[model samples]
Structure formats: C-alpha cells, structure tokens
Target: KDLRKKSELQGTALGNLKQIYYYNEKAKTENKESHDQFLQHTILFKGFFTDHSWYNDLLVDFDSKDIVDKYKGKKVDLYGAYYGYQCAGGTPNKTACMYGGVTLHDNNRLTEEKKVPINLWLDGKQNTVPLETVKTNKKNVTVQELDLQARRYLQEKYNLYNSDVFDGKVQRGLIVFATSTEPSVNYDLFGAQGQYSNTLLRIYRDNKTINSENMHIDIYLYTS
Candidate 1:
C-alpha cells in the first residue's frame, strides 16, 4: 500500500527517486565530472523510445527472438532509419528511385557521438523477399545490408561521410518494414493512417497524399 500510494502521487515517487539517489551519490563522490557523466547517460533510457510505438514493438520482438541475440543488453549508442521509393518503372530509372539515406540521433550534444546514418532501398523486382522468408533468414542482415548500402550510396552519389564514421567497428541493430500503395505491388505492411490504399501513404491522409501526419521510422537507443 505504501508503494502504491507513492507511485500514485504526482511527481513524488519515481519522479524524485533519481534526483534523491543521484544527489546523495554526487555528494559522496570525489570525481564530480565522472558522476555527472554517469547521470547523463542514465537519463537516456528512462523515456528514450516512448514516443515511437513501432520502436516499442521492435524491442519486444527483439527480446523474444534470436534476431539480435548476441547484442542483447549491449549498449546502443546510435539509432537511425530512412525510407526510399522503389521504381516500378524499370531500366535506368530503376537505379534512381531505388535509393535514399538519412542520419539518426538522440537529444545529446550536437556532434560526433550522436549521429547514426542509415541507407534504405526497395527490394526491387528481382530481389523481393516475402515476409515469411525474411522472418527465417536468421542472419537478420536485411536491414543491416541496406544500412551498408546507404554508406555506399552516400560515397558514390553525394561524396559524403567517407571517414571513421564508416569504420566497421560501430555496432548496429534495426527493425525494418516497408509499405507501398502501387497497384501491382503491396508490401502488405501497415501504414501511418491505419488504412489500406494505392498511390499514397502517411501518418494521415485525405483520400491520397500526406497531410498533417508523419510516418516515423522506429529506432532504439542504449548506453553502457
């Protein structure tokens, strides 16, 4: 009953818990900078992915499956995602519409430690993977492979980020889903508006095209 009462109180229980604990610890520690750094990373996990439900789904599925078993409980410093359209039109046009990329980040300081770039592509007519087959691919490179491709695309197209950021040492994990309204193709994935349609998609829509809504690429973050 005491615990429940505290939890129910607005800004009284878990709200003040961290402040109290950290305050006491900070008082005792000789290394003030070290302790401050500790608190900084600590706050990240508290409500990090709370805004994106898709990321929430990814974490639950990740823990319940072998997709990223090796990286379980590992610190996740970078979170990134991007989307691109696949050209159903074919030929040289195929290569252009098929590529896109972007950088992901946290609310941390605006510098090297925060940005994570992910590259995306359409499966293409020739390399389409059914949802059933993707589930069993086991290696889970579907997302990671596209991530690597993004780096290559940046290097080739815009001549960007050709440095240590591309170094192979950085660890990465991601969950990917695709949606399209093209008549000949349907990725069969859910969309932001929660409805099925052709030639348009977003977090909301008025018969077609994006309106006041935005589709989010789900991502996760952690610290050691």
Candidate 2:
C-alpha cells in the first residue's frame, strides 16, 4: 500500500518525474498473440538527477567512510552511458532512449524550465526522440534512486564470486558475469582522462566499456 506513499502522486512534481523510457506498442504485439504470455518488460525507474563525487571512491572499497565525509564536492550530472549512447536498433530506438544514471534532486524542487517540459513530462516527446535524448536523461537525474545507490555498493565489490550463487536456484535467469578493465589499461598507462561504472543483472559481463541495458531484452533472449 505504498504507491508512492498514498498518492499526491508522491506529493507533486509528478512524483519527482519518473518514467525514463517506456515502450509497449500494444505490449509488443501482445507477446505474439498470447496464450500464457503475461509478458513483463521493465526499465521502471526511480533514479538520477544529481548526487556525485565518486560515491566515496566507490565507498572506499566498501567500508562506508562515513558518507565519504558527508558528500565531498557534490556536483552531479555525470554522463557517459547507461541506456542512451547507441541505444538499440530501430523501432523507437531513438538513437539512445535514456536513463543515464544519477539522482538526488533538489535544485529548490526543480526549475530548469521546471526541469524541462513542465518537469520531466519531457516536452511530451517530439515525434520520436530529441529533447536532447530526454534532455540528457532529464538533466541527468539526481535522486536515492542513486544508481540503485551505486548498485548497492558496487554489487559487493563486484561479487568476486565463489559460485555459491546467492543461495542458488531462481531458474533460467542468473547470467551475471563480471568485469573491470582497471580504467582502460589505466587510461593507456596513466595519461589522465578518466571516469567509470555499470550494472544490469538480469546480467552483465566485460566492460572496458559496453553496457547493453535492454535492447528488446537482448533481441529475444540472446536470439532465442
């Protein structure tokens, strides 16, 4: 019974502007003429607008150095890619439909023309992309929806697994691979241009940088 805390649509500002990107197109053709196809595809979000300063050096390798000395140098609007770089192929691909992460919003309760298009209504879509791809993912979100709070502390230091598999058995859906190319060969052996981070499990593996979020949920389960 917590639909955004008993609705005022979560106390105005359209519940702090959600809906990063949603496409149903009549439920993708009713999951190909349904029988037991109660299909559910979600990119459902409640994150990002600003909350920065290297999540305390990725939470000081997970020891929580006291909110990194309480938010050091916070100036978030971070960007590179999440689900809006070379996003998917056609069918409303919109050359990067967005949710490029970061959130903790409070620029005096939104005002960049009400955080664009009457506040995250996003100029109500321009006949297929352009409002600078959800206006750079709505001026790049800043909300607790904080990249799933740094994907719950960088998925416990990238899980460094032992193959116990989080108490095993959920069935046909735990392909979580892992990666970290020590900042692209340490930025080609320490030249200085740097930045990093990602997650999608439903699964993920390998990243000097290439994160595939949900391009039609892997063009049909890694092609049937």
Candidate 3:
C-alpha cells in the first residue's frame, strides 16, 4: 500500500501550529524564543523528553509489515519506544527504560492474559543507542510478534486476514501496542510496560479479541 505523504498530513494541533509558523509573526517570534532558550538552558536540553509521533502515522504500515512477515512464518516481537522530551519546551531525548502492553475487553468484561490475542512480550532495554535506531526497531518488534502468532492462531477464530477481524457479531479483534520511553515513571501508572503490553494482548484474544469494557496490563523485566 502507498504511504501517505508526510507533507499531506493534517493534524488539528500540528497543522494549526505549522500554519501559525508560516502565516503569523507570533509563531516566528516564539520559534526564536524556543531556539534561543534551548541553547541557553541545559535543563531544557537535558530534561526534555520525546515519544515518537511516527507511531500513530505509521501504525498501519507497521502492522501490515508485521502481518505479512508473520504470514510468511517469522517470530516477531512488538514494543513501544519512549524518548525524553520537554512537554513544555526543547528537543526530546530517550535516556531511560520503559514498557507498554496491549489489553482486551468485551462488552463489559476483561479477559485473562492467557486468553488474549498474543502473549509474546518484548522487554524494555535502555536507550544506549540513538533514538532513530530505536524507532526502526519499534516496527521490527511489532511485526515480529505478528509473525510469531500467525502460525498459532491462523486457524482460530481470530484470523486477522479475515474481514471478520472486527465484526462485533463475533466479538471481533482489536490490537493495541502501548509503549513508553520512561517506564520507571510510566510503568507505575500502568504496571510494567512490556509485560503489561503482552498481558493485555493475550487477555483480548482469549476469545475473538473482544473487549466490551476496559482492560489494563503491566510489563517489567526480571533481572536474574
């Protein structure tokens, strides 16, 4: 499938913000302030955090790649990457370990982790490499899990290849991959990220990958 051009993208905040930059002097002024401040302040540079925005835009493409590879019978793991950036200002950095997981629910009840769509979990590792390196792996990991599960569930009621993947009649299937750049900070809010992410994935797939209510899961690694 053809990917959407980045230039053609439209986001209420992103678009309006870009327009302000292009059409308004105030934006330019703010841009100058932002840049000047970034250079002058070490905290602004060091404290800023970043979570990849590409995930949202490229989710479908990522999913398709994983599904295709999984269809071809490969073992894949999906993960969410978090980078540290200033929500208030400055460029973001990925300096810590974090985790995210998927969950499933039905009309009103949550399912068991074992019953969820996929049980594979990718543990969180530190951002020793550059953020771009991490981003490339995000797609790779997710697709890995997809390929790994294809053989296990292809003949089951949760065939992603089927148009019925989301038919409410059969409870349908929904997949979510939650990741964080700083798990130590975010995991508490949601338990462990990777383990949690996988737990939720399994819970949903226990039956039709259906979740009627809401679901939650945790992810964390055990170090010997």
Candidate 4:
C-alpha cells in the first residue's frame, strides 16, 4: 500500500474527528475552557465492537459477550457520527454511549492539596486489551510502536494531551466503544442538572463520531 495514502487516510480520519469534537463542544456552550482542560488529560481506547454496558466505573471486560437485546437497535443516524456513514445519511458502525465518574489517586497533587479535583476514576471490573494488539496493521508497525505512535498521534493530530496539573505523570484513559450490532444511536447526555454535583469534573456526554474503520474513538467528557 502507498504509505502516503495511508497517512492521508489517517489524517482525514483525524480531521473528521476534530469536526465532531468542535460541533459537540459547540452544543454545551456553557463551559468551554474547563471542558477543554479535561480533554487535555484524556487517554484513548479503541473498542473492537463489543456490546458491553459501559455503566459508571463498572466497565465489563472488552471481551464480554453479554449483549443487551434492547440496545441492539440503539444505533441510529447520529449527526455526531462522521465519515463511514455520510452524504445524505448513513450510520456509524455501532451504537455508542458511555458514563463514568472522576476520582484522583491518593498521590495526586490535588488529592494532597485537599482540592478535591474529582476526575474520572477507572475502577473497572473490565479490562480492554492493549489497543494495538487487535491486529489492525497491514504495515511493519509493531504493537509497541503502534501504541507509541497512537500516543503521538493524539498529541499531534488531535488537541488531546496529558496536562501537568491533573495526573500528568499518569494519563487518564478513555476507552472508545462501538456496539457489536448495527448503528442506531443518536447520542445521549445523562447529567445536565446534577444534584450530585461535581464542580471540577463529572461523567457526561462528550461526542460520538467516527474516528476510524476498525472502531471509532468516541469521547464522553468527564467535564465540569
């Protein structure tokens, strides 16, 4: 394969993804910079089309086969989902949604400062694989190199990064999931008026858009 075209394809994917984030952030219009600050520390994960309930903090292992019969059709023509389903209106590869909480480790600076910087705490009964291990490569890229490249890609291609203020030494991870079945999700934002308040961060709807063919990297921002 032409290496340049492959690079171009990846660039195009990243471009559309930025469009997705741009539009979604446009919607929440309430808190911009704080949300962007959250994005800075967010890590990326690719779900290989598994139908797991990504409920708060209890993400089932990425290999779980407990497919919910109801959410099978939750995949709809999402205005947020991009690329693969385009033009008039197509659909994403799978239904997409997620929710979770934010907690800082004991060693964290904010935790030490007693600042209570509540961020997304990934206490999982689940285990998603080392992303590049899925065998998506048709190139000479090793799994380790792919991961390193993915990290750089997120840093360079997209604006997401590991911020020095919030667990900078430890990257806060984001696992992107797509439904194993058809695409029929429109997008859902769970907490708008939170009586269970989080001034610094809370698990909330970010955006669901196509990041790649293998499985799109969707973002549900744990925002202020």
Candidate 5:
C-alpha cells in the first residue's frame, strides 16, 4: 500500500471531519483555541469497536452469525461513553444532538453520573460495564511529528502510553469497572467496552452525519 496515499486519505477524512465539527451549529462552538485543542486531543482518543448497536437496523443484518451469537446470553459489565460534537449546541437543559451518540451505559448505583442506554440486547442479564474497567491508553507524538498526520488518523493509530493522561506512568490500569459486577448482575447495558463499534453507517442522517470514522487500537484488559 502507498503510505503517501494512505496519509492523504487520512488528511482528507480529517478535513471532512473538521468541517463537520466546525460547520455543525448544534454540537460545536466557535473558539479557535478550543477547536485547535479539540483537534489535537482528538488525536488521542483510543478504543476498539466491540459493539455495533449504533449501526441502524438496515445494515444490522450484515453482521456475521457467530459475532451476533456471542451476545446470546451476555450482559453488560460496566461502561460509560464519551460523545463528540459538531459545534456545541443545545439549551441550558438540552443537548444539541450532532454526533452526540449514546452508549451502553451501566447504572452507577454508587455514583450519580448517568449513563446512556443502548437499543440492542447484548445478552441475558447484561446490565452495564463499570467505568473502572474501561481503560484509557495513549501515545505522545511530538507536535512536529503529529503535524504529519490528520487528527482522526492520528487518533486511530494510538499505542498504549503513559503520559499526563495516565499520570505519567507507562501502565494500563483502569479501575472504573470495580463496582460493575457487584451486588447485582446487569444485562444489555449501554456504554460498555462494546457500544458503538459497528455503528458507522449513520453518516447521512437528516439530523446528523458521521464525518469521519476509524479504528483506535483496542487496549485490551484481561478480565480472566
């Protein structure tokens, strides 16, 4: 494969994504510094696409039977989701709804933070994945090196690193899910490790568009 063409594709995709972020009046805000910072940090978001609930029903039929079968008797463990915006819309009490998609949220009976729900069933008694288990990994590319790639592309190429995001240690320890499997077992919870994995076909909705889509390395955690 031509590395240059690949880079160009990433640049093009990143440009379109930036357009979505900047042009959308609902989920984006107009601040040059924040926009730039967001673009920079956008390079750092990493995770795998384990869940496919975000893909509308039409394309849902295309998934492999084995893949679909895995969730037959599954349930959510513990998870939370983060959303992006086109600009930053909404009233003081409402969300603007750009790419502000929902995740398979786990009800934190301990804390007050509300998690969103996924529409599909993950398995039996599957509630939500705890936040402690969802890990955050990173890679610190110098500003100069980062300039060589697109924002989304850079994000898609993450390696597990230790920087300020992880307290300056090169370790992978996510404790958010500590309370997930406690007292009760949850099922089909949203925002777990597998929320929006295969749901990228929603780019052309009349309400919103998926300007860019790419995979970030799945920094796996050995639950066993």
Candidate 6:
C-alpha cells in the first residue's frame, strides 16, 4: 500500500506505521463515517529521532490536551494541529498524515534539572498523561511556584468557583503547563531557537473536574 511504503521511507516504526494503514483500509472496506473521519484528520510523525523533531514536540503538546478530552471522545485524528504545522513547513504531502504516540510527557522538555521517567510503547498502545508525575511536582518550588501563580491567574481569568456548582453542575477541563524554557535534545536537533514550553490550560466542558472546583486544572512545571 502507498501508506505503508511512504511511512517506511519516513522512518516510522512498523507498529505505529501499521495503525494508519489499518485506518485507511478500514475506511474503504466499511465506508464508515468514523473511519473516514480518522483518515481526514489524523497524522503520523517519526518520533524519538530525526529532522522532524518539531513535529514530534507538537504532538506531545497536542496529546496532553487530547488525553484530558479522552481523544475528544472519538476515534478522529489526534494530531490535527500537527498537520497544520507540517503544512506551514511546506511540501504538505498528503501521506504525511500518518500518526504515532509517545507513552509519557517529554520529561526533558518539562524538567531540565531532573531525570524523569520516559514511557515507551510496547505493542502500539498510546501513552498516558503524567497526572501523577505533575502531582509530584506540587512541592517543587522552582516549578510549583509558577503553577500556583498560573492557578491564581486562571481563578480570576475564568471566575472559577471552589465548588462544582453555581445553582447547577459546572463544567471542567485540565491544564498542563511547562516549567522549563529549555528545548529538548530532539527540539535542538532541528536547529530551532530557544523555546518556552507552554501550559496547555484551555478550558473545555468535558465533565471531568480536578476536584470540587468549577474548573479542573493541572500544571506541568519542570524541565530538563
């Protein structure tokens, strides 16, 4: 298949490479709208190494938001934003839509001083958000101070409540922030300049809350 051939040339692993091929084939065989949607929006990147390091990092930021949304509660493309960035980089090849997943947050990008754990996929399973790891950073002053500051900003910016109700059930979403200004080795490999990792704190009404608060939030404040 053209999908497999191009992915092979792109330096993607066999496991992640097969996922998109399956989606395309499934779309044709069943003519299902969901499969069709997946084909339309999703994309793949050669993660772990290569010239496409920016693509890989963009996927990392994108997935943090996706996980809190449960992949937008559908099987659609998870890297739609990445595809847009790829287009900006020019060439905009159609087959560039293949996709891959990292198993954990980029510890190197988030916590520059500490050596945090990196999760790997064994049989094509997707990586989970590092909620526990972020929770661990709750006490680290270098990062948590900024987290507290960001939380204060959110509390005022959104008029958030401590309780999950304002005469009715309130909506909530998670916020993932980056503590380091340092780019990862992969990011540096692309010859890009210095970067400030972002706090992915956009509000959505996904029915999940951090606590009793009207807005759920978590801050990733560390970098390598």
TM-score of 5: 0.20
Q: 1-224 in candidate 3: lDDT tens per residue?
A: 12222223233332232222122211000000111222111111122223433211111111222323321222222222222221223232233211211111112122322212222222334212111111111211222222223322322322212222233121112223333431211111111112222221222221111221122222222111
Off by over 4 Å in 1: 1-46, 49-60, 82-224
Model 1 C-alpha lDDT versus the unseen true structure:
0.21
Give me the overall lDDT of model 6.
0.24
lDDT tens digits, residues 87-177, model 1? 2221222111111111111221222221222223222112222221111111111232232333333234322222223431212212233
Flag the better candidate by TM-score, 3 or 4.
4
lDDT: worst 10-residue window of model 2:
215-224
Q: Model 2 segments beyond 4 Å from truth?
A: 1-81, 84-96, 100-141, 152-154, 157-224
Best of the two (1, 4) by lDDT: 4
Give residue 60's lDDT in candidate 1 (0 to 100): 12
Clashes of 6: 13
TM-score for each model: 0.18, 0.18, 0.16, 0.19, 0.20, 0.17
Q: What is the lDDT of residue 224 in candidate 3?
A: 14
lDDT of 2: 0.20
- The candidate with the higher lDDT, 2 or 6, is 6
115-182, model 2: which lDDT tens digit per residue?
11111111132122122221212322322122222222222322211122442111111112122322
lDDT by residue for model 6 (96-186), tens: 2212221212221223322223232212343443323323221122222222333333343332222223221112323343324332211
Higher-scoring candidate on lDDT, 1 or 2: 1
> Tell me, what's the RMSD of every candidate?
24.4, 22.8, 21.4, 20.4, 19.0, 21.2
